Amino acid sequence: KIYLIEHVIGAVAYDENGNIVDYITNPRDLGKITEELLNNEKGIPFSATVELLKKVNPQEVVVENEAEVPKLQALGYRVSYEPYSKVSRIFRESLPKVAIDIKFASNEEDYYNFLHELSLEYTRRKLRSAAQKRDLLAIQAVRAMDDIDKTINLFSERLREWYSIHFPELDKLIEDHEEYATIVSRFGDRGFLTIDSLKELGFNEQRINRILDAAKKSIGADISEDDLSAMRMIANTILDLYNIRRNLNNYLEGVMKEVAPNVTALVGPALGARLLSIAGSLDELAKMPASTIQVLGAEKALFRALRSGGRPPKHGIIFQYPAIHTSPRWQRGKIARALAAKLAIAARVDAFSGRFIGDQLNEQLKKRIDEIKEK
Amino acid sequence: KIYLIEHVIGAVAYDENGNIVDYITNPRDLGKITEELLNNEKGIPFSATVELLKKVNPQEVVVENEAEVPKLQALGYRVSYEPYSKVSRIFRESLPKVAIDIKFASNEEDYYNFLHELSLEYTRRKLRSAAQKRDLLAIQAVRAMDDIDKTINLFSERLREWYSIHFPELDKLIEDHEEYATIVSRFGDRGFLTIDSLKELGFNEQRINRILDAAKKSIGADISEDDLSAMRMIANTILDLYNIRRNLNNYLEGVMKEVAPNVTALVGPALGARLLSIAGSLDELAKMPASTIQVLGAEKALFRALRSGGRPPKHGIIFQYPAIHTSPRWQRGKIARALAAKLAIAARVDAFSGRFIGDQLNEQLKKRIDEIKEK
Amino acid sequence: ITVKQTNMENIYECEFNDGSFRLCTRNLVPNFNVYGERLIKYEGVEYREWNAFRSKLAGAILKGLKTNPIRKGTKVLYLGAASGTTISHVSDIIELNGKAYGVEFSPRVVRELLLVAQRRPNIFPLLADARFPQSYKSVVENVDVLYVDIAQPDQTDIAIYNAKFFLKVNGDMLLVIKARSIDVTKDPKEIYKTEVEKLENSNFETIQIINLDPYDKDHAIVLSKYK
Amino acid sequence: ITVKQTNMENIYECEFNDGSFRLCTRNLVPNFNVYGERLIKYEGVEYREWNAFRSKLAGAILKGLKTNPIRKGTKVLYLGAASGTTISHVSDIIELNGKAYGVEFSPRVVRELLLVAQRRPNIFPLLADARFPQSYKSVVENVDVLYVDIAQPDQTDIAIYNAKFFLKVNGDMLLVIKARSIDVTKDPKEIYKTEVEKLENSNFETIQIINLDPYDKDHAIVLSKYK
Amino acid sequence: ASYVKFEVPQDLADKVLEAVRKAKESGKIKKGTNETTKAVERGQAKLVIIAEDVQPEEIVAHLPLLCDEKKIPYVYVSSKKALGEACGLQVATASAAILEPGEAKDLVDEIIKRVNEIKGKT
Amino acid sequence: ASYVKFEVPQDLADKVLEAVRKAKESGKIKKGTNETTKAVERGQAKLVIIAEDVQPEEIVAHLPLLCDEKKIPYVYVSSKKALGEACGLQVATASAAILEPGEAKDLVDEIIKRVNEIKGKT
RNA sequence: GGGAGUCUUGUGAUGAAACACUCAUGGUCUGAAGA
RNA sequence: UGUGAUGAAACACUCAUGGUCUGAAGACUCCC
RNA sequence: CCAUGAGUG
RNA sequence: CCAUGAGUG
Ligand SMILES: Nc1ncnc2c1ncn2[C@@H]1O[C@H](CSCC[C@H](N)C(=O)O)[C@@H](O)[C@H]1O
């Protein structure tokens, strides 16, 4: 019976007593060790392990890691693992020393000089594979889009408050923020309004006269061009911002179809993106129960109920789903519960690499929405 | 003794009992009444009131307004006022009716039609003189700056967390936000960084290489040009908003040397504007004791101490004054108290139409500051 | 749906589709709402849904205003008209015969009061400080009811002053007490008592003292008669 | 100003310009600071100011930690290394001879751990999940001290699993119990009794139980010996 | 001076200066411009006294406005040093206020009722 | 299916289903995928039972990962209808959890130890 | 320790809790009945 | 309908108005 | 929402 | 920060 070890130091064999039966030392080479370190994660034995499994030819072999066992059985051997074995322990208790003993390094002095540089480089590599994930861009993109949403709304309320020093009636005449900033951008003084800039917006002729009269009889304040230009800087930024949102929206749409097609199919790209931002990743989203996905984003209300034993929230960011916020209070709960359910199914096929199945999920979803609404 | 009444209805004289001695009805003309109601606010007598004091030729006149009293004296009569006289009530007790009696209108039906459209017009007018105040622009402007201040910070924080998916090493290498923003905006992929476009920013040759070496050695992700151009939308906006802020700070200075020079003289346009925003107007800041100005902008902190008998805030938005946030903790309290004192004098000399005196106000202030610092 | 009169003039309750009950006033300018309220037709008449949570007067009623001095054909001085929420509804109540004068010294907000005051000949906008009743003196007459919902530390002292200008003897005054806008330190229940004594030492005959909670926290309305 | 040794190796106190007393360590990498900490020279030697409010270790020290198992040349496995605030200071304590293996599985944060791990040969950074020590089995040795500061509901179990891999017998574990991250409903103090029992069932000998409040709310640190 | 709204005769002026003094002793006063402003906002002041030689004037120009909004009567005295040394101070004061008249109730009631006559009130 | 790491002999698969049943009576169990997920998240399940005939495969795929994180053993049964109908339901179930074995202690402890031998554990 | 003056100061001495934001980790409802 | 039935408090903001600290001390110098 | 670690204006 | 009246995404 022979017990087997895997490390930067190489591959070593022990009898159960804790004596090195045979060893094959690793190359003291950063590049190569790193790789075999990444590989032993997936079950791949060090190359030094395969040779050592050859010099002594043991009837019973046992390793540290359970992902290795199916690989080594495929080489012909009878293999198992004992994770935190007396041998593995006996092995590291002597790691100050046995690096020198199997002649991996001359002294204790530059074993750590190296093990450090490997430790530096092994993780530097993982830092990269992580940044390389597709879903991070999906998350950062929509967080940023929402940062713009907030901003547009803020400036618009400033600009309405600000421009109304000059032209108050205009505020209550245009519901749309984008339409309004566009008026202030193009014209300036209230007295420069002309019909063609107004027919260019999409404004129907009836509104057009109501606007031109409003400007005429305005009890507003007469103001310098320096004052108007100030307002218009704020106005123009609002317009810029509206464009970028749509660009980002398109950018997000692609990504959200690339990394997470099924989830995107159910609730659309942003909200799918949104849930990716709260969970942190797709794979973390996938492992979630529906009862959690249902309330993601209502953390204040959730922990209020859980602390106090009061009533919980029906919906978190899931609230944005058109069906939910259009529908009455008693339907929302049943719609959320059903939706979240479909969502974990949507998510799980995505992360665990399933091919697109979003259609029947939708069908399944809209069905349950119909059973619900028919009461 | 004749008690004199003044109304939209015209000008009335009464004996002490409340019996109509004589009248001169106003013309049923919106235009003249609106101007005379505004004039009577400054004490100017109705023109119709002027005639009535000629026909009847009274020893003693008494008016409803104490502001009117000196005007009619300058006109030659002996005048006083009784605020809520029994005659004034008697007049108005009979106002549904005596409107018809003196023939201002035929009936009740359209005296009320008129007084309604006077009131619409009389206040349409007052609504406009309010809009005409210059400090309003100062307030709206500086509100918009702080809005850009916030946005920039937000967008800047987003770009960095985002752009670090590709090039994580640039974040902690460039302390300043705008600078970071230009680098994302001119280049894109880290692999386009060049000494020349980078020597164009002003980067000392040493930091440029620290930058370029980091770009070479980046454990960030190789990422497409769509992702990158998406991030750049945000980088550019950060740049637009800084340019716009720099314009608004310049606009603001203009309005602020104009409407409140001494305040400005002391604390500058931004901070001064800011106190105008908080007080509501220049004339509200003028009326503040320093004990308020000193705590304007600490309302959470203030009332917390006021409700409970706790410790008060030392300073409010005043925290922004260089002397205050730089000087050690024990000095802030006194500097603030001294600034606020001067600010209130300054605000008061500015509103009540004083000329610039900011030189000595600063001199006096740096005195109080130099003393504080020598302990 | 079902709509029927209540014990008070021009004021109704509604039975609804589900079995819910909400106050309303008879719409003086049909098809037009000053805030977002439901418009409801019942036997072909249009009424305006009167949210108590927004208007102090509906609160006082739904909190038991025993009797209401504002009715069909009443003349009122309304200090603090603001955007026009409550005064639009008293327009529905006093109903053309009667008249309402709106004092309000805040222009950002009179801006929207203009609108409510165009559509309605009941309502007479006046941009003034109720602390100087001299400035609006020359546009109004005397009134039966003095409705005061103004944010001031001496709101009551103001109210008393306007009172001795314009309140007909034996008129009713509805004075709204804002504890937290008189003093956020003091206990609200302590304040109402301390202010009601203000009215009674100045000879108002307190008819009823109403606490608005939950319609309005730390709020009370007093009805008293002027002598 | 004066600097002097304390009862614990390579950990120092300062008499200051005013008379405040603050912890610090002998700076392993002079002229260089990992968070914003003050650098202080005395008789020509440089120390790093160890803010207890950021670092849990300094808290437990300032709260009467009986004995410190971290000293000149200790080999320590540190689960949940995060930004490197605390682990930078245990570098100063162990001093080139000693070795510190730092686990942390949030890439966003290992990013700055990297910077700290570069100047310091004391520190061996590992982007990994402390729940699977199979992953860092192939880089580390066995250790004298197991410092576990991870925000996890099964943080205690993680510590334990990690111990029977890397904890020498008669070696020590410093386990930070982060109550609100274990269960936000239970009383923090109930949490502590249950977790220490966990230690005591795996033949850990509870040596000392410290509460980090006021430096860290609802937090406790356990020092115990593995048998 | 322009923040000076109406005219004070030195007999009227003096009854004030005595009136202040008895109110330190028997009542309650607030001394200083900032305290007088707070005293008015608060409706604690029963009588507000303003000096005529303030420089610059605009320092106390706001008190007439405030006193009418809160309907508090105001009066002038000619020297600020004189109003301070009444106040129990050894330096000047530009404005002062009586919140509690005390054993000057009768004396204040005479002044507050006299500046009304010179203001044209019946 | 691919989310099943190892192979269950039907002498073990059935001794599984029986251990579930005794746990409804004498112990405490949980049924359904979302609840198993929580019983695994919370460290309540001692044994987690996942079906092999689930459609689509991805629904229960996260459980192996999870369970290895919380070191909670997991086992497969061949039929989904049977696992649900075992639970005291008349419908299928994709995954379940035993929280307290009750009178399946000796029975469970034997399973988790046989599924260990089949996993190559010493 | 007793006595004594000088400068600053109600045009404000002394005391004394300004505010706005981003990231990372964990704590993340119920569970068999429904028409 | 356990591939989740029933119950059941999603989140980000703007304007207007009022409530908006303390109050006479602090630093120096010369006599036995 | 609570707790922890890293920062910005 | 509290209260009140009007509004936004
Ligand atoms: N001094 C004053 N004079 C007149 N109105 C004032 C005032 N001070 C405050 N107000 C106004 O009083 C209003 C209180 S809200 C009350 C509005 C009205 N009661 C309604 O229910 O619709 C505020 O909008 C405020 O602008």
Ligand SMILES: Nc1ncnc2c1ncn2[C@@H]1O[C@H](CSCC[C@H](N)C(=O)O)[C@@H](O)[C@H]1O
């Ligand atoms: N399972 C896990 N494995 C490794 N690290 C984990 C973990 N779960 C949480 N963590 C990390 O534990 C850290 C706790 S913050 C720790 C502060 C730091 N140890 C110091 O005192 O300086 C978080 O950064 C989190 O990322």
